Scaffold this active site. Structure first.
Site, PDB file in Angstrom:
ATOM      1  N   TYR A 140       0.858  -1.178   0.000  1.00  0.00           N
ATOM      2  CA  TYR A 140       0.000   0.000   0.000  1.00  0.00           C
ATOM      3  C   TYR A 140       0.897   1.232   0.000  1.00  0.00           C
ATOM      4  O   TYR A 140       1.809   1.348   0.823  1.00  0.00           O
ATOM      5  CB  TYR A 140      -0.892   0.009   1.243  1.00  0.00           C
ATOM      6  CG  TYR A 140      -1.777   1.230   1.343  1.00  0.00           C
ATOM      7  CD1 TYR A 140      -2.807   1.444   0.429  1.00  0.00           C
ATOM      8  CD2 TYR A 140      -1.576   2.181   2.347  1.00  0.00           C
ATOM      9  CE1 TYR A 140      -3.619   2.576   0.507  1.00  0.00           C
ATOM     10  CE2 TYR A 140      -2.383   3.319   2.433  1.00  0.00           C
ATOM     11  CZ  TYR A 140      -3.401   3.506   1.508  1.00  0.00           C
ATOM     12  OH  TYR A 140      -4.208   4.617   1.579  1.00  0.00           O
ATOM     13  N   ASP A 229       9.521   2.488   0.029  1.00  0.00           N
ATOM     14  CA  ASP A 229       8.460   3.181   0.735  1.00  0.00           C
ATOM     15  C   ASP A 229       8.642   2.858   2.208  1.00  0.00           C
ATOM     16  O   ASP A 229       8.215   1.803   2.688  1.00  0.00           O
ATOM     17  CB  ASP A 229       7.079   2.723   0.263  1.00  0.00           C
ATOM     18  CG  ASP A 229       5.956   3.486   0.950  1.00  0.00           C
ATOM     19  OD1 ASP A 229       6.236   4.151   1.969  1.00  0.00           O
ATOM     20  OD2 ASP A 229       4.800   3.416   0.484  1.00  0.00           O
ATOM     21  N   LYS A 257       4.687   9.262   8.534  1.00  0.00           N
ATOM     22  CA  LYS A 257       4.259   8.899   9.878  1.00  0.00           C
ATOM     23  C   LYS A 257       5.159   9.377  11.021  1.00  0.00           C
ATOM     24  O   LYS A 257       5.045  10.521  11.448  1.00  0.00           O
ATOM     25  CB  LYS A 257       4.031   7.386   9.940  1.00  0.00           C
ATOM     26  CG  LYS A 257       2.884   6.951   9.024  1.00  0.00           C
ATOM     27  CD  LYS A 257       2.547   5.470   9.140  1.00  0.00           C
ATOM     28  CE  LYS A 257       1.228   5.185   8.435  1.00  0.00           C
ATOM     29  NZ  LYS A 257       0.851   3.749   8.446  1.00  0.00           N
TER      30      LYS A 257
HETATM   31  C1  LIG Z   1       3.801   2.177   3.372  1.00  0.00           C
HETATM   32  C2  LIG Z   1       2.756   3.270   3.341  1.00  0.00           C
HETATM   33  N1  LIG Z   1       2.758   4.189   2.347  1.00  0.00           N
HETATM   34  C3  LIG Z   1       1.841   5.192   2.269  1.00  0.00           C
HETATM   35  C4  LIG Z   1       0.838   5.298   3.253  1.00  0.00           C
HETATM   36  C5  LIG Z   1      -0.227   6.367   3.267  1.00  0.00           C
HETATM   37  O1  LIG Z   1       0.223   7.398   4.146  1.00  0.00           O
HETATM   38  P1  LIG Z   1      -0.903   8.550   4.230  1.00  0.00           P
HETATM   39  O2  LIG Z   1      -2.114   7.913   4.809  1.00  0.00           O
HETATM   40  O3  LIG Z   1      -0.381   9.702   5.214  1.00  0.00           O
HETATM   41  O4  LIG Z   1      -1.271   9.176   2.806  1.00  0.00           O
HETATM   42  C6  LIG Z   1       0.806   4.347   4.316  1.00  0.00           C
HETATM   43  C7  LIG Z   1      -0.266   4.429   5.410  1.00  0.00           C
HETATM   44  N2  LIG Z   1      -1.125   3.241   5.376  1.00  0.00           N
HETATM   45  C8  LIG Z   1       1.774   3.324   4.359  1.00  0.00           C
HETATM   46  O5  LIG Z   1       1.753   2.409   5.371  1.00  0.00           O
END
Ligand SMILES: Cc1ncc(COP(=O)(O)O)c(CN)c1O
Ligand SMILES: Cc1ncc(COP(=O)(O)O)c(CN)c1O
Lengths: 420, 420
Positions: A140, A229, A257
């Site tokens: 994701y 990521d 995060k």
């Molecule tokens: C690996 C990863 N990349 C992107 C995101 C999305 O971050 P955001 O919700 O702040 O757009 C997440 C959050 N689930 C994530 O875990």
């Protein structure tokens, strides 16, 4: 739960699905509303204290309202919270982050992990002059078109043009054969390969060394940029994140995060050569009214200092280990097939399957059992994600009494569900 | 400016172009760094007080660190700043916003105007089952592929696939003939028409009534959704924004800036029928770790209450009017061609052109003159955007001494530049 029930009724007609983010709607029996959070606990609007093993899905590795971070934010608030011009905190945070993830490189702060991966993808395409992006089933990367795709690439969301989806290739996570095959067929058109070093949104799934090796080799030999990521792994798997933890190197490192200390954030880091393509230096566009938000910067800076000065990693690791050992002791006695994947402070339980090394296997886990466990744990004052495909996160406050409650809660909840 | 100079040197190798957002790099002679902001003023790291006519490019209509908003944020901070579960503030803010922009509808909170317009576009495509999006030359909707396009649609940014750009149509702002022609040719494939009711990123450009009329008629007759990008106009042109100000109605209303009180924010509002397509209710995906961020919600709620209880609109309108009258008095005497476009509290000066009703005309304005004006005004303690294509914003603190300084500064700066 009268107050949460009332709020539940009010939001039904205000928000689609009654929530501002999908996962929030799955809490059983129905979503509780939060009054406040402090340390290892969330407190419902009705007044109930709950041990938090979700930690806002990753950002709160220091727990709720960490004293050091609170003080830094209070000082930052007194200075005004938005300028539209450069501030000091963004400089200090950038220097600290780059020293750990990309020494001598550059960074660009954005407002969400979604904006971050989206920017990284545009940068990889701009740098290579190629259009295709390769992602993995189960990974994701946020809420933007290019990553809302699955292997026929076809859309996994309505409203995403097929013409857009077809520019994204998808193969299974940890599948070296499939990875080699996709590069053999499309390699010269792949601008970048994006991947979570440790999957956190298909339950928790650790990477195979052979998969990590292939990712680095194939990207380098093909000319595609390796986009790690690390929105979740960054600063969670140690100060150096996944690169340091697994001894791997990415061309572009996506962060989020934790680096915002709990405030809206995202970031893209990479070599000067790649990062220099971003506006106003280059032609790859990126701008944001809230980029490098003063409070996000101050909160992130204080958070990283805590990670450097406090035993966050050891405490968090031990908390996750205790939970894993407790669950394993109970489950081993049942003889039922199951597996628990844990990497430091991120983990998840999968009932019904003896191995989970990819999304396909994670999807085979017993969802009904998990939902019952989530509900029983909440009844016992412990909050774990309502979805088996989310992760369990531990942090600094998960020690002493808080940890005892979590472990005892997990043990009892498992026994209750197993006895039903 | 020794301290700003030092920071300038440090960021050169940390951020592309030395900044986290393009416009910030254009400040002359070089970007000053901000220590804090309060009321109508920004204070540089070297200690200089500057009247702020940028207001972070729109969000700070209440000025810096507004007392009411500060108190609300302090209370919110004490409750922890991130939960990953529903809170109370998001409910109250949603109810207040919808009561003004889409009664009986729904809303989804995101983290930037970019995320907001991106989500709106996905929603329009999902609702209509169509792929094309129509935007106008000069309109800015954020940093995402679908809106980084210009009429050959071709990319305006590197890293944007041509296949993606071609799904976006582009015609001139305020050009009814061109608008009718594009719908005659592609109308049945247009999922949505996105537009700023008042352009704010090509200088300030007011809409023609005939253009607004055509937008509503053609969208309704073709089946395309009218997406009003009110990220800037929302809550600036009165509580009801552009819809109330111009007596128009949009299918989807994109909001941002002001509604977050200065914290990262974005939002999409619309009818229950359209909004219900968003996950977890429908299949149009949207999720966000920071969606409905507790602090953003608390700050936005307090901000809107101030807009309802304090004379923000009258004060801001009068401030902009005073600046416009002062500049006009000086410029009228020169006999030189020029035009000032103002809509309530947003405005911009264009030297060298007698009329600016579209981006093409705005681009013909004397950029060198504007840059000199920006630099001279800053030398006199007044901060206006470094780019002639940005806007000048006024707010609540622009009264009394602060306004006197701004007006006198504008008068003197114009005379100085005109005399050079
Ligand atoms: C690996 C990863 N990349 C992107 C995101 C999305 O971050 P955001 O919700 O702040 O757009 C997440 C959050 N689930 C994530 O875990
Ligand atoms: C009309 C409009 N839409 C979208 C945006 C982008 O908002 P954000 O920077 O928070 O992504 C802006 C800000 N320039 C805007 O003025």
């Amino acid at each position: 739960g009268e107050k949460s029930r009332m709020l539940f009724e009010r939001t039904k007609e205000l928000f689609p699905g009654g929530v501002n983010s999908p996962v929030r709607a799955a809490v059983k029996p129905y979503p509780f509303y939060v009054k406040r959070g402090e340390g290892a606990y969330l407190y419902t609007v009705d007044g109930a204290r709950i041990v938090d093993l979700v930690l806002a899905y990753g950002p709160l590795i220091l727990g709720h309202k960490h004293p050091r971070v609170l003080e830094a934010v209070e000082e930052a608030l007194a200075r005004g919270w938005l300028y539209g011009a450069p501030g000091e905190a963004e400089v200090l945070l950038a220097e600290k982050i780059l020293g750990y993830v990309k020494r001598g490189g550059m960074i660009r702060f954005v407002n969400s992990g979604t904006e971050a991966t989206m920017t990284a993808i545009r940068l990889a395409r701009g740098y290579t002059g190629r259009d295709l992006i390769l992602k993995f089933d189960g990974c994701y990367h946020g809420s933007h078109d290019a990553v809302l795709v699955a292997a026929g690439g076809v859309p996994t969301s309505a409203g995403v043009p097929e013409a857009v989806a077809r520019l994204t290739l998808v193969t299974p996570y940890n599948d070296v054969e499939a990875l080699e095959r996709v590069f053999a067929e499309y390699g010269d058109r792949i601008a970048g390969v994006i991947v979570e070093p440790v999957i956190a949104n298909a339950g928790v799934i650790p990477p195979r060394r052979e998969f990590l090796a292939a990712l680095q080799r194939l990207s380098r030999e093909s000319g595609a940029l390796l986009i790690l990521d690390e929105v979740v792994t960054g600063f969670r798997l140690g100060l150096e994140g996944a690169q340091g933890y697994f001894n791997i190197e990415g061309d572009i490192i996506v962060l989020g995060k934790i680096i915002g200390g709990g405030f809206p954030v995202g970031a893209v880091a990479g070599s000067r050569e790649v990062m220099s393509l971003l506006t106003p230096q280059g032609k790859v566009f990126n701008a944001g009214t809230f980029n490098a938000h003063p409070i996000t910067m101050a909160a992130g800076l204080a958070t990283l200092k805590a990670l450097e000065e406090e035993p966050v990693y050891s405490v968090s690791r031990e908390a996750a280990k205790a939970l894993e050992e407790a669950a394993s002791e109970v489950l081993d006695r049942t003889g039922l097939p199951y597996t628990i994947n844990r990497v430091e402070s991120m983990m998840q339980l999968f009932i019904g399957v003896e191995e989970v090394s990819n999304a396909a296997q994670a999807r085979k886990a017993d969802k009904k059992f998990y939902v019952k466990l989530h509900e029983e744990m909440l009844r016992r004052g412990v909050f774990i994600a309502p979805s088996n495909l989310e992760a369990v996160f531990t942090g600094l406050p998960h020690q002493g009494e808080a940890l005892e409650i979590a472990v005892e809660g997990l043990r009892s909840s498992l026994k209750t569900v197993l006895g039903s």
